């Protein structure tokens, strides 16, 4: 008979301060009672949100995962948990008569956050191309994948998780793959399709607070 939502209470989930829209949305949870505390009921929770509302004037076909780590009263803060593309984009990306390229790498950033990377790429037909299809020889696919592997690992090593996300929202890393792999085979839509998180180093609160603060 008792309405559970009378027992529940609403928090607000806040993205990292490096994001211009800090407000993600509002969630609900039961009030802290018994051995249950709304603190640890709130941590370990994900909030998928499209990049269009995360930034001001960027595309909508990219989404982020945003695991929650603390509760600050009404505030319950989150950080980057994983990025992916809208499946409608992905299925529209694939097409016949051109070869899709896939690669992955598992790299450790300088702060102890190790990431699993997924990148996709497709070959372009030229403006004057008259052959119906545009394929790549197997060895070409190897070497464009090998270079897309090494620039992906080289960029994460030199920098940290803070500097990896700021340059990830524009997906400017995808622009410098095709800017240098064009000389070996012209690709036209290359994106990092997915990123997945595997380990969280020691839960350093000072690093989380300061990225969420000044």
């Amino acid at each position: 008979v008792v309405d559970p939502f009378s027992k529940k209470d609403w928090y607000d989930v806040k993205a990292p301060a490096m994001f211009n829209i800090r407000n993600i949305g509002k969630t609900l949870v039961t009030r802290t009672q018994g051995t249950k505390i709304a603190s640890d009921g709130l941590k370990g929770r994900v909030f998928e949100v499209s990049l269009a509302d995360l930034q001001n004037d960027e595309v909508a076909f990219r989404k982020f995962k945003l695991i929650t780590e603390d509760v600050q009263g009404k505030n319950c803060l989150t950080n980057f948990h994983g990025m992916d593309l809208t499946r409608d984009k992905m299925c529209s990306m694939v097409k016949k008569w051109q070869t899709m390229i896939e690669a992955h790498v598992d790299v450790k950033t300088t702060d102890g956050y190790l990431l699993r990377l997924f990148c996709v790429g497709f070959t372009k037909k030229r403006n004057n191309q008259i052959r119906k299809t545009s394929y790549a020889q197997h060895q070409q696919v190897r070497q464009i994948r090998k270079k897309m592997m090494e620039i992906m690992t080289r960029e994460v090593q030199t920098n940290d998780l803070k500097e990896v996300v700021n340059k990830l929202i524009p997906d400017s890393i995808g622009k410098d793959i095709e800017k240098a792999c064009q000389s070996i085979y012209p690709l036209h839509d290359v994106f990092v399709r997915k990123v997945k998180m595997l380990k969280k180093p020691k839960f350093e609160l000072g690093k989380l607070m300061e990225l969420h603060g000044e």
Partner: protein, 140 residues
């Protein structure tokens, strides 16, 4: 308004967002709706909970009646914007959504409910789980 304590402290201009997991497969239709996380569900209705005919569970008639009950429950609570997550049976089974996907979507729109991004979350495999048909298939 006021409700009172149910639903968060909101202003006039802004709105609160939810997600509707619309599982409109064949043989049934689900218009589940949850919070933005996905796990603290608010109102769960299915086509079968309304039609008593045991065969119209995926019919369009069952589809919008279930959705409006979710729709009516949303305004009772306070949730007013909804991202929509379509999904079919998926897996090794069929990928096209059933006949109740559209009728339930129409009901939300005619119930005056803001709709955000629309995505389909049909579980697609990487060529796994050999399909239950046998070699010669369903020879009906």
């Amino acid at each position: 308004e006021q409700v009172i304590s149910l639903g968060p402290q909101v202003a006039e201009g802004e709105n609160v967002f939810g997600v509707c997991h619309i599982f409109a497969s064949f043989n049934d239709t689900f218009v589940h709706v949850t919070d933005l996380s996905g796990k603290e569900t608010i109102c769960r209705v299915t086509g079968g909970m309304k039609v008593k005919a045991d065969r119209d569970e995926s019919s369009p008639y069952a589809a919008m009646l279930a959705a409006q009950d979710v729709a009516q429950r949303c305004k009772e609570l306070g949730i007013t914007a909804l991202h929509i997550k379509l999904r079919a049976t998926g897996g090794n089974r069929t990928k096209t959504p059933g006949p109740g996907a559209q009728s339930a979507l129409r009901a939300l729109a005619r119930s005056g409910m803001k709709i955000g991004r629309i995505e389909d979350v049909t579980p697609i495999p990487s060529d796994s789980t050999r399909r239950k048909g046998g070699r010669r298939g369903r020879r009906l």
